Amino acid sequence: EPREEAGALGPAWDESQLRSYSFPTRPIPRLSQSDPRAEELIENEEPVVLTDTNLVYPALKWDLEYLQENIGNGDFSVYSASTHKFLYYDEKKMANFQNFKPRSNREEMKFHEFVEKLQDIQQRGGEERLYLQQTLNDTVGRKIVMDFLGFNWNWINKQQGKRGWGQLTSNLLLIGMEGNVTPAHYDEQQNFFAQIKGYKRCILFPPDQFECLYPYPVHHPCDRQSQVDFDNPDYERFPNFQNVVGYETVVGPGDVLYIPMYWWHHIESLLNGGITITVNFWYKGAPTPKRIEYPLKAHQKVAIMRNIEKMLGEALGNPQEVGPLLNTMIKGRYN
Amino acid sequence: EPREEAGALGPAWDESQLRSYSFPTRPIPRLSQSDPRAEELIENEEPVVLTDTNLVYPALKWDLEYLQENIGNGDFSVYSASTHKFLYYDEKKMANFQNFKPRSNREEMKFHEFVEKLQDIQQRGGEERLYLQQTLNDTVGRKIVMDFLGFNWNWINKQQGKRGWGQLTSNLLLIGMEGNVTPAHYDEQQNFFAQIKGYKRCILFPPDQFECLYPYPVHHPCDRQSQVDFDNPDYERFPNFQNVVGYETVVGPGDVLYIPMYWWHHIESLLNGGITITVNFWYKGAPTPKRIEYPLKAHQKVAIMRNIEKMLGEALGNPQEVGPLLNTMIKGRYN
Amino acid sequence: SIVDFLITAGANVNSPD
Amino acid sequence: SIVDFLITAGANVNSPD
Numbered sequence: 145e146p147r148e149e150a151g152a153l154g155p156a157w158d159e160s161q162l163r164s165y166s167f168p169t170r171p172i173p174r175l176s177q178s179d180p181r182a183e184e185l186i187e188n189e190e191p192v193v194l195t196d197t198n199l200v201y202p203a204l205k206w207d208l209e210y211l212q213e214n215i216g217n218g219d220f221s222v223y224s225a226s227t228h229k230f231l232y233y234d235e236k237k238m239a240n241f242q243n244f245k246p247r248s249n250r251e252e253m254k255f256h257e258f259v260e261k262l263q264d265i266q267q268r269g270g271e272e273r274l275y276l277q278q279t280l281n282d283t284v285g286r287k288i289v290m291d292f293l294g295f296n297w298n299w300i301n302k303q304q305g306k307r308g309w310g311q312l313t314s315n316l317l318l319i320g321m322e323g324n325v326t327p328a329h330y331d332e333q334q335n336f337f338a339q340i341k342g343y344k345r346c347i348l349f350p351p352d353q354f355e356c357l358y359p360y361p362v363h364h365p366c367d368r369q370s371q372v373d374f375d376n377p378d379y380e381r382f383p384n385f386q387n388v389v390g391y392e393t394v395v396g397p398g399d400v401l402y403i404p405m406y407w408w409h410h411i412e413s414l415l416n417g418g419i420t421i422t423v424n425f426w427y428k429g430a431p432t433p434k435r436i437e438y439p440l441k442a443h444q445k446v447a448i449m450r451n452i453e454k455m456l457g458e459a460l461g462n463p464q465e466v467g468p469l470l471n472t473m474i475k476g477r478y479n
Numbered sequence: 480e481p482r483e484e485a486g487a488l489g490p491a492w493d494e495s496q497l498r499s500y501s502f503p504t505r506p507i508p509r510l511s512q513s514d515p516r517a518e519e520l521i522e523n524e525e526p527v528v529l530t531d532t533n534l535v536y537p538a539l540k541w542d543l544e545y546l547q548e549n550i551g552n553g554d555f556s557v558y559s560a561s562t563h564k565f566l567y568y569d570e571k572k573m574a575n576f577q578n579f580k581p582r583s584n585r586e587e588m589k590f591h592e593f594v595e596k597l598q599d600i601q602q603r604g605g606e607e608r609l610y611l612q613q614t615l616n617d618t619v620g621r622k623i624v625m626d627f628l629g630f631n632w633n634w635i636n637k638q639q640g641k642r643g644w645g646q647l648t649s650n651l652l653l654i655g656m657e658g659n660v661t662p663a664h665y666d667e668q669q670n671f672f673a674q675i676k677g678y679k680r681c682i683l684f685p686p687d688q689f690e691c692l693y694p695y696p697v698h699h700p701c702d703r704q705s706q707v708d709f710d711n712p713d714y715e716r717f718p719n720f721q722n723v724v725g726y727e728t729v730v731g732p733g734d735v736l737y738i739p740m741y742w743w744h745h746i747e748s749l750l751n752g753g754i755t756i757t758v759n760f761w762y763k764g765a766p767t768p769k770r771i772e773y774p775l776k777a778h779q780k781v782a783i784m785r786n787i788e789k790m791l792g793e794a795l796g797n798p799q800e801v802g803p804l805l806n807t808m809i810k811g812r813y814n
Numbered sequence: 815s816i817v818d819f820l821i822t823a824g825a826n827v828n829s830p831d
Numbered sequence: 832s833i834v835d836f837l838i839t840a841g842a843n844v845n846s847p848d
C-alpha cells in the first residue's frame with residue numbers, strides 16, 4: 145500500500161493515480177540496506193527497493209528552480225510527444241526500418257528553455273508532454289558538482305565491488321511530467337534507480353518472461369522494448385501476454401530501486417503527482433563465469449538470442465533477411 | 480523419354496516402371512563430356528548426365544557372380560527393410576532421439592552371404608528388401624583392384640582440379656533390389672554418380688527448395704533427409720511441398736550423373752528392372768571464396784542454418800532445447 | 815568455446831548516448 | 832569474419848562410414 149509520510153502528511157499517493165493494466169502483480173520488497181535479505185536479493189539479481197541508502201541525499205533538495213540556477217549551460221536532450229508513452233528508439237538503427245515513424249521527437253535545448261516550455265504548456269493547458277533525459281556530464285555548475293560528489297559512493301562502490309560489476313558507465317537524469325510512461329523494456333546493464341522528486345510506479349518482469357513480452361527485432365530502432373501496447377494489448381499477435389505477471393512498487397524521494405540487468409521494467413510518473421526527478425546509476429554486468437552451469441539461466445538464453453540475431457544480420461549482409469531465414473529454419477522443422 | 484538400346488534391343492525401360500509422385504519435373508540434360516554445355520553445368524553446380532565418360536568402364540562387366548568371386552572376404556554393410564524406402568539414418572545421433580525407431584536395419588555380412596540372402600528371398604517370394612551400401616576399401620580382391628585402377632581417373636581428376644574441389648573422400652558401392660528407394664536428402668559433398676547395372680530414376684531439387692522439403696533437425700539421426708513422405712505427403716505439416724519442382728533423369732549402365740553438393744536427390748531402382756549397381760565418387764567441395772558476394776547463394780544460406788542449429792545445440796548443452804529457443808526468438812517477433 | 819561466445823552480453827540501455 | 836565462420840560447409844553424406 146501507499147506509504148504514510150512522516151509528520152502526519154498522509155499518504156504520499158493513492159491508488160487512483162495508477163494506470164490500469166491487464167496483468168496481475170505482486171510487490172517488490174522494500175527493505176533497509178542493512179537488511180541481509182536486501183543483500184541476498186541483489187546478489188541473486190532480483191529487484192529490491194532500498195529505503196535508506198542516502199545514495200542521492202544531496203539531490204533531494206533539487207527542483208526546477210535549483211537545477212536551472214546551477215546545472216550549467218549545457219544542452220539537454222528533451223523528448224516531446226502527444227501521447228503519455230515515450231517509447232525509446234535508437235536513432236542509428238532507423239536506416240534499417242525506413243517505415244518506422246517515432247511518436248516522440250528529441251530536441252536539444254538549454255535547461256531554462258526546458259523549464260519555459262514546461263511553463264508555456266501548463267499556462268496554455270496544452271496536451272504536449274515533455275520528458276528530459278540527459279546524461280550528467282562535466283558541464284554542470286559547481287553546486288551540482290558538489291551535490292554529485294556528496295552521493296553515497298561508499299555504499300554503491302561497495303555494491304559494485306561485491307557483485308563483480310564493471311564500471312559505472314553513466315548517470316542519467318530523468319525529469320518527467322505527471323503521467324509520463326516509459327514503456328516496458330530491458331537494459332543490458334545493472335541499474336540503481338534513485339528517486340529524487342515525486343513518485344514513479346515501477347513494474348518489473350523477470351528475464352524468463354521474454355516469451356510473454358515480444359521485444360522488437362534486434363535491428364529495429366526499438367530493440368529491447370516490448371512490442372505489446374500495454375494500454376491495448378493485441379492478444380492475437382501476442383497471446384502469451386495473457387500470462388505475464390509483474391513485480392510492482394512505487395518509489396518516492398529517497399528510495400533506490402535495484403533494477404537487475406535484463407529485467408523488464410515499465411515506469412510511470414503518477415497521474416496528478418507533479419513532475420518527477422530520478423537519477424539512475426548504470427553499471428556493466430559482471431564478466432561471464434569461468435564454469436557455465438547447465439541448464440542456462442533465462443538471461444543467458446536472452447543473450448544467446450540477441451547474438452544469433454546480430455550474427456545473422458551481419459552474415460546475410462541485410463537485417464531484413466534475418467526473419468525469413470529464421471522462419472525457414474523453423475517451419476515444419478521445429479514447430 | 481527412354482533411350483533406345485543399341486543393336487535394336489528396344490527401350491531399356493518404360494514409364495510403367497516409375498513410381499508416381501505429386502510434383503512436376505523437367506529433364507536433366509544428357510550430354511557428352513566433350514560438350515561445352517556439360518562443362519558449363521558442372522562449373523555452375525547444376526546437374527548433368529554425362530553419357531560417354533568411361534568413368535567406370537571396367538566395372539560394366541560387374542554382376543553378382545563376378546563380384547562374389549573377386550570382391551574379397553571383407554564385411555559389407557547391408558540394410559534390410561519391409562518397405563521400399565531405405566531412409567538413411569545416422570547411428571551416432573540416435574542417443575539424441577530415443578524415440579526414433581528406424582524402419583531399416585543394418586547387418587554386416589560377407590558378400591556371398593548377401594547373394595545367398597537375396598537368393599533365399601527370391602526363391603521364397605518374400606517381401607523383405609535388401610540394399611548393400613559399402614565403401615570400397617583395400618580388402619577387395621585383385622581383379623577388383625585392377626578394375627578400380629582402370630576407372631577414368633584422368634577425366635575425373637581433371638574435373639576435381641578444374642572445380643577446385645578437395646579430395647576424393649570415398650567411393651560407395653550400392654547394390655539394390657528392383658523398387659528400392661533412397662528418400663530425398665542432400666549431401667555435403669560433390670558427387671559423380673556412376674551407374675553400372677540396371678536403371679535408377681534420379682529426381683533432384685535445387686538448394687533453393689529447402690523450404691519445400693523440410694529436412695529433419697540437424698541433431699536428429701535423419702539430418703539432411705526430407706521429412707516429407709513422398710508417397711503420402713502431409714500438406715498440413717509440409718504445405719510448401721505443394722510447390723516443389725524436380726529435375727529428373729533415368730541413368731543406366733555407362734551414365735554418370737553429376738549430383739552437385741547440397742542438391743536434394745531422390746533415387747529409385749526401377750520397378751521390375753532387376754538389381755542395380757552404382758559406384759559414386761564423393762569429393763569435398765571447394766574452399767569458401769575470398770570475397771563473399773551478396774546476396775548469398777541458397778546453398779550458403781543452408782550452410783548458415785546448419786551452423787546455427789549446431790551452435791545452439793552445443794551452447795544450450797542439450798539438442799532438445801534448440802527448437803524451443805528458436806520458436807521463442809521468432810514468435811510474434813519475426814513471423 | 816562457442817558457448818562463451820554466444821552468451822557474451824552487450825551493454826545497450828535506453829540512453830541518448 | 833562472422834560470415835566466413837557461418838557459411839563454413841560440413842562434409843556429411845549418406846555413407847555408413
Ligand SMILES: O=C(O)CNC(=O)C(=O)O
Nearest residue numbers: 318326331335411424828
Ligand atoms: O525512468 C524512466 O522513465 C525510464 N528509466 C529507465 O528505463 C532506466 O532507468 O533504465
Ligand SMILES: O=C(O)CNC(=O)C(=O)O
Nearest residue numbers: 653661666670746759845
Ligand atoms: O543410390 C542411392 O540409392 C543413394 N545414393 C546417394 O544418395 C548418393 O550417392 O549420394
Ligand SMILES: [Zn+2]
Nearest residue numbers: 330331409828
Ligand atoms: Zn530502463
Ligand SMILES: [Zn+2]
Nearest residue numbers: 665666744845
Ligand atoms: Zn545422396
